């Protein structure tokens, strides 16, 4: 049985995979991590005890029958009541996370991907360094809490500019309503005069590389799905003084494909969402690999890639 | 240069390791994780440019000169002012953590221990499973949010009882700012009638094994320092079978340091409890049995292997 580690509000990727798994003659159990412990019962035995078992209403999954694990979405304990004490709620979340992580890490069979591999590939500074050691171009990157280094960094890349971004995912719910998020943003001359807040939280700054194309590369095992989109606000080839777009298939150079495969092999991954950009002079710059990045918007929308089939195959075929 | 990843309020283990490193003709930089970003400056470069530098007052460290890393204490940014907005503070703590973790993971040289190894050995359920696969006795354990499975677990071990414990480390601060902590605690029959709170947080229950001694085992490389106390620590000689099994457990997780807890029954049965990759050791060095552990850590940090 394929154990699918997700949450209740996950998107259409889950039913796409379970049906492709079910259509191959195998079965799959959906484990919504956010509905634990409030609704889902998990029993984890260590020793010569009874078998570990996950119970979700009528559904029941014995952990000895797990042949594969899809390490998809991890939202441990989100459905804990809001009216709970904040000290007990934060402590309960950390206990739930350690519990379910220990369950997954103890299960045998095929993992997509193992926790130790996803954890090790989540260091974005290590991603760029390993990609560069493999011969891939990476943008100039500085994570810093030091204004003098940041000023020096923005100055040497003044012609094209620099952006900033956070290494973490989070949101600030301010005032009375909305959620606020730090997207990758250009830093301005005015932002450079207000660098005093770096002593309370560092940021990651990157060389802003002008790009002709954005590449979205999804790898399943050794199968490479490459999609490109023209993001040029001013496209030179089409420019006309007298006078939409969508994602389309793209053929990577076999050298880039073999380098991305070595990147997957180094971290031990069999799934990965890789971001690259292509300059007008056809230089390929590696940006980021997300071991749990999305893929559904490349399958349900152009170029309608059949990734969910490839994932279900490697899950039920192991290797 | 040995990078030492600790924090400002960490105990007297750091200076002794430092002096032992310095007395061996090498250099050592102390990096207090809690004093970043408010005081310590870190600059992590990726790309064709540099690697990075850590600046702390007059002291600076070029990450190119890092020959080894002691992954000791990780209190990322706990010296943030408490007058800060709580939403911004927790977001800053999460950003500071990912920044320094990526710094450590990217560094080459000898790590004691690597992050990926420590994160993998942190699964206590995996510790008991691998210890059992190597031939070590482990107490019957149940992690659960299910009262029915817990009641059966307590009836199963009704003769000796069961204890409960939390997998996580935390502390609840009451109204008087007093510090509350969940130690390993017995489970009474009154507790078994109030299991409804398991739907809000699971717990880890274990067979209460009656014991004669409690063993504190500290391993540096392949050197084993065993202490025993009656439940004033004393030396203790493990059977070689137990020592080799613990060495195989460390080699599986890829650790060269570990704090291992065991108990011995009156009939001399050795039960494996836990391995903490960053567990303390100083109290076994400054107090009986005065194990020279800080010397063994400094020697493995300088001599690589």
């Amino acid at each position: 049985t394929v154990l699918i580690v997700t949450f209740s509000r996950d998107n259409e990727s889950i039913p796409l995979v379970i049906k492709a798994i079910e259509a191959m003659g195998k079965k799959a159990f959906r484990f919504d991590t956010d509905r634990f412990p409030t609704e889902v019962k998990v029993d984890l035995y260590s020793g010569g005890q009874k078998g570990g078992i996950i119970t979700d209403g009528d559904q029941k999954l014995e952990l000895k029958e797990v042949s594969a694990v899809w390490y998809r979405r991890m939202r441990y304990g989100l459905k804990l009541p809001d009216g709970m004490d904040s000290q007990f709620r934060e402590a309960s979340l950390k206990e739930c996370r350690l519990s379910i992580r220990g369950m997954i890490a103890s299960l045998s069979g095929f993992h997509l991907d193992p926790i130790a591999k996803v954890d090790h590939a989540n260091h974005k500074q290590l991603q760029l360094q390993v990609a560069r050691q493999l011969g891939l171009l990476i943008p100039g990157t500085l994570t810093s809490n030091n204004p003098e280094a940041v000023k020096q960094f923005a100055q040497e890349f003044e012609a094209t500019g620099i952006v900033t971004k956070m290494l973490s995912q989070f949101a600030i719910y301010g005032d009375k309503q909305e959620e606020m998020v730090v997207f990758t943003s250009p830093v301005t001359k005015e932002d450079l005069d207000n660098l005093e807040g770096l002593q309370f939280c560092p940021m990651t700054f990157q060389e802003n590389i002008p790009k002709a194309l954005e590449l979205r590369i999804t790898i399943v095992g050794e199968q490479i799905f490459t999609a490109a989109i023209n993001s040029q606000q001013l496209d030179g080839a089409i420019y006309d003084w007298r006078k939409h777009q969508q994602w389309q298939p793209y053929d990577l150079p076999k050298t880039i494909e073999k380098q991305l495969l070595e990147l997957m092999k180094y971290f031990g991954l069999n799934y990965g969402a890789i971001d690259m950009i292509v300059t007008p002079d056809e230089r390929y710059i590696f940006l980021e690999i997300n071991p749990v990045g999305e893929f559904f918007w490349l399958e349900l929308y152009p170029p309608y890639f059949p990734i969910s089939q490839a994932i279900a195959e490697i899950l039920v075929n192991s290797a | 240069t040995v990078l030492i990843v600790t924090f400002s309020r960490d105990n007297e283990s750091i200076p002794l390791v430092i002096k032992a490193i310095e007395a061996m003709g090498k250099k050592a930089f102390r990096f207090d994780t809690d004093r970043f970003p408010t005081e310590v400056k870190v600059d992590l470069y990726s790309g064709g440019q540099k690697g990075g530098i850590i600046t702390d007052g007059d002291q600076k460290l070029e990450l190119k000169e890092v020959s080894a890393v002691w992954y000791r204490r990780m209190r990322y940014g706990l010296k943030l002012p408490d007058g800060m907005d709580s939403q911004f503070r927790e977001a800053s703590l999460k950003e500071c953590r990912l920044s320094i973790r990526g710094m450590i993971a990217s560094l080459s040289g000898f790590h004691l221990d690597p992050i990926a190894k420590v994160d993998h050995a942190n699964h206590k359920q995996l510790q008991l499973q691998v210890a059992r696969q190597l031939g070590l006795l482990i107490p019957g354990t149940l992690t659960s949010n299910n009262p029915e499975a817990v009641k059966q677990f307590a009836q199963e071990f009704e003769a000796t009882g069961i204890v409960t414990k939390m997998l996580s480390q935390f502390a609840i601060y009451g109204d008087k700012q007093e510090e509350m902590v969940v130690f390993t605690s017995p489970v009474t029959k009154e507790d078994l009638d109030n299991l409804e709170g398991l739907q809000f947080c699971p717990m880890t229950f274990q067979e209460n094994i009656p014991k004669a001694l409690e063993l504190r085992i500290t391993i540096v490389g392949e050197q084993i320092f065993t202490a025993a106390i009656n439940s004033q620590w004393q030396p203790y000689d493990l059977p070689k079978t137990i020592e080799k099994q613990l060495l195989e457990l460390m080699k599986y997780f890829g650790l060269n340091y570990g704090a291992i807890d065991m108990i011995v029954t009156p009939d001399e049965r050795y039960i494996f409890l836990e391995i903490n990759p960053v567990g303390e050791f100083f109290w076994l060095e400054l107090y009986p049995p005065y194990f020279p552990i800080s010397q063994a850590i400094a020697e493995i940090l300088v001599n690589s292997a």
């Binding site: 004490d85 007990f88 | 510090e179 509350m180 507790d191 709170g197 809000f200």
Partner: peptide, 12 residues
């Protein structure tokens, strides 16, 4: 709305 581990909180 209390979790089960609240019953075992001691004083450090």
């Amino acid at each position: 709305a209390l979790p089960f581990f609240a019953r075992f909180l001691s004083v450090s």
